[PDB]
Design a protein around this ligand. Structure first.
Ligand SMILES: [Ca+2]
Length: 769
């Protein structure tokens, strides 16, 4: 490996061998069907709301999130980079697809598949990833840096449906070598969203944009239809000329054939036919190819950028609503703009790399932080793009000021912005894209007084329940299978209108968003204040025994819904105390004296009673009335965690919080698989896991990272990082279970998982407050 020295990969990049088999991978631990796409994954390409494309560490374009809200795992084999090399003095060169695999059927059988093992590495530090190719049959060593312009405090480039592939080639030998790099792509119009005739009318064109010191050559793969539908649009691939390289292309090869129409050209001398052909296809799949060819002398390096763009302007949800995607603000809505997007990337990618470096540098340059922590911090951000992200720029046929946004809980539980989950998972948004975060919270504020009296059948027990109660915050903002933003509370497994935690979490999120954006946004507090007061006032009505605290009912009524809480619980009770303190503070900011006095009075009574009912001398009891009331809960002081972040001070005595956190480390972490897998949710005082429910026996990855941040804030530095380390190890390490770029909600002691590709572990960013 002589190429690494010619590129700059950070030491904290996650690494794996190209073609590496992983032996220890986990699988779903539930009886019901659950997504398991394997460990062959990678960092995604594409901006927020653009649809994303997962290119895996084996080189394949395999995890397709282009249909917003859906996860489709299938390798499109025509989509590849390939290389040709010929040493000066040899009769023949060699050609090789840079993919560690081969097609299942006989399509593309002429291509050289099965990129060999131990011949290159994949690296990832989101939004960047890299491949290096160090192969005994390829005298010239190659590397590529691939990324999309995902940039904090930038709502423009961050939205773009584009990726850049910056190639570096170096000749460490003492002979001249001819080299070609080829990008192939299938015309994927009709891959989704088209009910019949899936390739019909697809056609490919070549664009040559020649100006001074810019030549770009690109293929635009579109359809002859000018219809404005979810399925229609364009893909483009292309390259920018650099000194010392020539460009060749092939506009049309058949992907549903043996591929030799293209490969006989490339494998001879790395130079394509330059054949244009705009003939539309009928049943056959078609694709395009863009190549560069160059000669490298001994010791010579060259850099050449390729790009990929996709203009699919309309997203459609299962309930029928069609919306324009955010990037259409910058490029248009007609679906004929892929070249414009590609050109912007090829002319500006160096600027974008520097913008990414500028945001990563403060963390990467901090030598007090271990590299593993940086690995997790950056790579967990994959989910912001990969989580079915929806970001609208108008309803099809509709202009408003704001652009609604949603991130999925996950794909198995296909709900947008699940409130309980975003209480943990929304840290990167408030910290790095706060205008999005505040928009999402205004969306929630708008729902507070919505009433929908129609009943639905509750999944868990078959009871009928009211859809949406006035004054109760919704569980979620809809599903991609239905009507995101329009039809809320798509979730039906339980009834969230009786939950005792959501209204408090909502209030805490509001005050968080004010505090973490500088305590200056009084207009945001003004917009949300009525909903805050409503939320707390409705919760107060659920105090049955008049101790000042809403009562858990011993039936599903908070996020740990099968792990029953009854009476006053540490979890809901602490969240309540913190929400009351937050609302007092908002009251002072907005000069709402009567609110300040009321919530101060409620707070004083509740705090007193919480302490008497639950403090046992070592930790806070799980609750007052369950059979498992003395369980040590990892999340017992979630309200105090958020109070630290919101700078609300002590809601509980410092000494008791310290004892509680120490107990949690001692038990839930260190007595669970030797502290190497995170914090199990529930443990009995005898040191054995609470077996009263499956949820108690799970580590929740996002709960564990949040607990680590709480420990960190309280000065328990070793315990904080040791606690978080288990989650990193399980996710990314060779000794873990192979969950990179699909971090799940939970695992059990065997390492097997529930709900891969989950929002909650974005909570690692609470460690950066
Ligand atoms: Ca009560």
């Amino acid at each position: 490996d002589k190429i690494s020295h010619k590129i700059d990969i950070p030491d904290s990049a996650w690494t794996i061998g190209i073609g590496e088999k992983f032996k220890n991978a986990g699988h779903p631990n539930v009886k019901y069907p659950m997504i398991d796409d394997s460990y062959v994954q990678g960092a995604p390409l594409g901006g927020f709301g653009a649809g994303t494309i997962g290119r895996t560490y084996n080189g394949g374009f395999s995890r397709w999130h282009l249909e917003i809200g859906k996860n489709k795992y299938t390798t499109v084999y025509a989509n590849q980079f390939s290389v040709f090399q010929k040493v000066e003095g040899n009769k023949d060169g060699v050609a090789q697809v840079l993919y560690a695999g081969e097609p299942e059927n006989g399509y593309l059988s002429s291509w050289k598949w099965d990129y060999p093992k131990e011949s290159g590495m994949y690296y990832a530090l989101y939004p960047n990833s890299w491949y290096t190719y160090t192969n005994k049959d390829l005298p010239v060593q190659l590397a590529v840096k691939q990324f999309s312009p995902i940039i904090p405090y930038n709502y423009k480039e961050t939205s773009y449906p584009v990726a850049v592939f910056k190639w570096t080639a170096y000749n460490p030998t003492n002979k001249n070598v001819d080299v070609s790099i080829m990008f192939t792509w299938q015309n994927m119009i009709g891959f989704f969203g088209k009910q019949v005739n899936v390739n019909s009318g697809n056609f490919n064109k070549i664009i040559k944009d020649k100006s001074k010191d810019s030549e770009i050559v690109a293929a635009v793969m579109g359809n002859i239809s000018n219809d404005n539908e979810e399925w229609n649009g364009e893909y483009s691939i292309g390259v920018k000329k650099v000194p010392g390289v020539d460009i060749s292309y092939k506009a049309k090869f058949v992907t549903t054939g043996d591929g030799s129409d293209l490969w006989h050209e490339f494998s001879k001398n790395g130079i394509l036919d330059n054949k244009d052909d705009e003939t539309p296809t009928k049943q056959d799949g078609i694709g395009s190819a863009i190549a560069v060819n160059f000669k490298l002398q001994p010791g010579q390096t060259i850099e050449v950028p390729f790009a990929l763009s996709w203009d699919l302007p309309i997203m459609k949800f299962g309930g029928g609503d069609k919306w324009y995607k955010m990037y259409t603000k910058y490029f248009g809505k007609n679906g004929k703009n892929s070249f414009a997007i590609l050109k912007e990337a090829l002319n500006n990618y160096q600027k974008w790399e520097k913008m990414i470096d500028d945001w990563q540098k403060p963390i990467l340059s901090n030598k007090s932080k271990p590299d593993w922590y940086k690995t997790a911090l950056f790579n967990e951000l994959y989910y912001l793009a990969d989580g079915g992200t929806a970001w609208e720029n108008g309803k099809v046929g509709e202009k408003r000021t704001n652009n609604m946004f949603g991130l999925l809980e996950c794909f198995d539980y296909n709900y947008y912005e699940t409130l309980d989950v975003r209480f943990y998972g929304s840290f990167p948004l408030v910290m790095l894209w706060p205008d999005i975060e505040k928009q999402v919270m205004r969306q929630f504020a708008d729902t507070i007084n919505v009433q929908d009296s129609s009943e639905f059948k509750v999944g868990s027990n078959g009871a009928m329940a009211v859809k949406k109660v006035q004054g109760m915050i919704p569980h979620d903002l809809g599903s991609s299978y239905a009507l995101p933003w329009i039809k809320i509370n798509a979730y039906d497994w339980q009834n969230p209108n009786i939950w005792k935690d959501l209204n408090s979490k909502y209030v805490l999120l509001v005050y968080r968003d004010y505090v973490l954006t500088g305590k200056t946004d009084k207009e945001f507090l003004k917009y949300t204040w009525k909903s805050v007061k409503t939320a707390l006032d409705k919760l107060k009505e659920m105090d049955k025994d008049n101790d000042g605290i809403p009562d858990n009912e011993g039936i599903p009524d908070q996020t740990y819904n099968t792990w029953s809480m009854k009476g006053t619980s540490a979890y809901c009770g602490s969240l309540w105390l913190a929400a009351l303190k937050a609302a007092q503070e908002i009251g002072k900011v907005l000069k709402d004296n009567e609110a300040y006095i009321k919530y101060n009075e409620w707070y004083k009574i509740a705090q007193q009673n919480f302490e008497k009912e639950l403090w046992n001398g070592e930790y806070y009891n799980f609750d007052t009335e369950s059979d498992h009331k003395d369980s040590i809960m990892a999340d017992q002081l979630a309200g105090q965690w958020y109070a630290d972040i919101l700078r609300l001070g002590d809601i509980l005595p410092k000494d008791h919080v310290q004892k509680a956190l120490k107990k949690i480390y001692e038990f839930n972490v260190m007595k669970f698989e030797n502290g190497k897998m995170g914090a199990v949710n529930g443990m009995r005082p005898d040191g054995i896991v609470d077996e009263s429910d499956i949820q108690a026996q799970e580590v929740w990855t996002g709960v564990t990272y949040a607990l680590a941040s709480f420990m960190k804030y309280r000065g328990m530095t070793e315990e904080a990082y040791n606690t978080a380390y288990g989650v990193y190890k399980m996710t990314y390490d060779k000794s873990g279970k192979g969950y990179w770029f699909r971090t799940p909600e939970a695992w059990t002691k065997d390492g097997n998982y529930r709900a891969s590709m989950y929002m909650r572990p974005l909570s690692i960013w609470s460690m950066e407050v």
